[PDB]
């Protein structure tokens, strides 16, 4: 059986024919779960929630719970999940809610260790790897190719810039641009993800951008808006490092909560 | 049928006629349900343990299991749960300890998010907000209407002042008086919960009386004796803070570990 | 014994005293000794081997393979010993072919809820792991060390015997054996004495100790000139000589340094 005798799978389910249900797990009325997708054990599935190819979800997973916001009255708002994602053990992902745009997300590629939490309305890219105990609030964004180390929470509304680091046992209370390593409680920026940016095929030349780039943001008494006209213009300065100083600047520009500092 | 037909009921467990119970989770033999609860599925109700009505327990929640404590000797000890608690998941709720009363209490309205851990002989009130993965050692008191924000721990007899809140990633290891917010490893106080006291029906002359005895205490430069006596007369204004200053002034004097600073 | 419901799958060798609890899965390459009870829910998987008269609670996820990126389905191990207590919403796993291959965890250990033991953990004997301690991959803990709750272990750290880290602590470096650490991140704060009256040890032991603990971090000598003193001591002949012996040896063969 590709799913287990002891599985309950709620009619309304869609399951592609290849997904594996394990032992005494659960599988909710509108969920929809695509091609060679695996759920482990004792795990939960639920909520209006789309589930991509090639997922493994492991055992004691509570994916598509409902959110923990006050607010919150049953309404039926979404998860949706792409491909290829590892989930392990005692993981949370929730849907979102109506007060925000009714949807958590997840792409594709992504890394989610043991406990786990992503909380409503969290919009999390690709590549990113979420380390054991890492717990996001609500309305989090996580931007593609992002580590969150173990052990860490997020504030609510916070940005994780594409490429960025978050070290273990940090608390993150304001935005980490794109490229920049962050530790700490509160956590604070100590400069460029060298080590991540050179496995990921970055150029010296791109890399040495920004870290100039770091130097104008963070170390020359710059404004927030006086660091823009910079930025942008080391953004066309037609080197190697163009497109990732625009991320940087467009990212900033788009800051709610403001920037770590 | 409202006990799921995988559902494990212990023979003397005592359910009121409706309560739910989900597919896979058990009720041990000395638990007692009040009227209207539901059992999410795969969760473990067990110790002689009684809880109320309207309380919507979820999914893998570990309800009156032992004490972590190495001197527990399987004694009979007690949880106590009250009313319209909504508790999540990965949660666990320990039962009392004969050195202590016995028991480990929760009253009515509150809110437990997931991986929130209550340890043996807590004695939490109502309307608390327990944010996801805050964790309470032995024997905390939690007074009403409390917020404690998520990754946070707090030390074995510790006291959490009615109104009070704890930031994110705190922690603590020292009382938070009533109506404080504080925040950070070690928590600090970080000043009165105004905008909290307001929604809750306190009156601006109430809330000014409480940010006057918040400078008594802690901005003043008077020590701990000086501030007893200038609080204990501040209580004594004849206005409308005088009863939420006098709480103040009670809880105080009562520290066995001193309270923040 | 076996709860009717429990799934002990084809291949499992449990000793026939082994009791299982209601919807438990005992994976096919698990090994459980005389007296071991498994709780409900709970799922013992991997090339795992269980000893004697354990205590492993509900939603015990024992012998769960290596969150390593770099796994790939090796039949890699976890070694468990005797009467230890491991509780609820627990993560034990199993080791990686890039270390050697398997994570260990001796006799008389107390695991609490939510304590997360990451692939080739080398863990010794009367361990206390308090709820929430969570040590990522390759960290080697010593004989009667206490990890306070809610902290992290960076991976490969060591923390020595007698050792003890405080309560919501984020542990980068080792901690010497007989030391007490804590803050985020973590730094000594002197001597285990109470640790160390209650496990035997003499007042002259716990003094020499004491001159131990100054020479390596209050007497503001170099590593170089601390580790040569500490040696001098050792070879002084005296009552706690074995014990900074110890200390040396481990600051020593220290990869990542030593908390400062």
Same mark, same amino acid.
């Given at each position: 059986?590709?799913?287990?005798?002891?599985?309950?799978?709620?009619?309304?389910?869609?399951?592609?024919?290849?997904?594996? /249900?394990?032992?005494?797990?659960?599988?909710?009325?509108?969920?929809?779960?695509?091609?060679?997708? *695996?759920? @482990?054990?004792?795990?939960?599935?639920?909520?209006?929630?789309?589930?991509?190819?090639?997922?493994?979800? =492991?055992?004691?997973?509570? #994916?598509? =719970?409902?959110?923990?916001?006050?607010?919150?009255?049953?309404?039926? *708002?979404?998860?949706?999940? !792409?491909?290829?994602? &590892?989930?392990?053990?005692? &993981?949370?992902?929730? *849907?979102?809610? +109506?007060? %925000?745009?009714? /949807? &958590?997300?997840?792409?594709?590629?992504?890394?989610?260790?043991?406990?786990?939490?992503? =909380?409503?309305?969290?919009? #999390? !890219?690709?590549?990113?790897?979420?380390?054991?105990?890492?717990?996001?609030?609500?309305? /989090?964004?996580?931007?593609?190719?992002?580590?969150?180390?173990?052990?860490?929470?997020?504030?609510?509304?916070?940005?994780? @810039?594409?490429?960025?680091?978050?070290? @273990?046992?940090?608390?993150?209370?304001? %935005?980490?641009?794109?490229? /920049?390593?962050?530790? @700490?409680?509160?956590?604070?920026?100590?400069?460029?993800?060298?080590?991540?940016?050179?496995?990921? =095929?970055?150029?010296?030349?791109?890399?040495?951008?920004?870290?100039?780039?770091?130097?104008?943001?963070?170390?020359?008494?710059?404004?927030?808006?006086?660091?823009?006209?910079?930025?942008?213009?080391?953004?066309?300065?037609?080197?190697?490092?163009?497109?990732?100083?625009?991320?940087? #600047?467009?990212? +900033?520009?788009?800051?709610?909560?403001?920037?770590?500092?």
């Amino acid at each position: 059986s590709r799913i287990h005798p002891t599985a309950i799978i709620e009619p309304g389910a869609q399951l592609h024919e290849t997904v594996e /249900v394990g032992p005494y797990a659960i599988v909710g009325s509108n969920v929809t779960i695509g091609a060679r997708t *695996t759920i @482990g054990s004792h795990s939960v599935i639920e909520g209006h929630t789309t589930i991509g190819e090639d997922n493994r979800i =492991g055992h004691y997973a509570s #994916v598509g =719970g409902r959110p923990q916001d006050m607010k919150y009255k049953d309404e039926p *708002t979404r998860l949706v999940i !792409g491909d290829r994602n &590892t989930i392990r053990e005692f &993981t949370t992902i929730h *849907t979102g809610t +109506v007060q %925000d745009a009714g /949807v &958590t997300t997840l792409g594709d590629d992504n890394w989610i260790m043991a406990y786990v939490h992503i =909380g409503h309305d969290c919009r #999390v !890219g690709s590549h990113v790897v979420l380390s054991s105990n890492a717990q996001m609030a609500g309305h /989090v964004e996580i931007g593609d190719w992002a580590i969150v180390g173990g052990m860490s929470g997020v504030h609510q509304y916070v940005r994780i @810039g594409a490429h960025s680091m978050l070290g @273990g046992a940090s608390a993150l209370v304001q %935005d980490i641009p794109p490229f /920049v390593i962050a530790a @700490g409680n509160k956590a604070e920026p100590h400069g460029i993800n060298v080590e991540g940016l050179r496995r990921r =095929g970055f150029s010296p030349d791109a890399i040495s951008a920004l870290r100039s780039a770091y130097r104008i943001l963070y170390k020359n008494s710059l404004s927030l808006e006086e660091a823009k006209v910079q930025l942008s213009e080391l953004a066309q300065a037609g080197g190697d490092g163009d497109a990732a100083v625009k991320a940087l #600047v467009d990212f +900033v520009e788009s800051s709610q909560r403001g920037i770590i500092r």
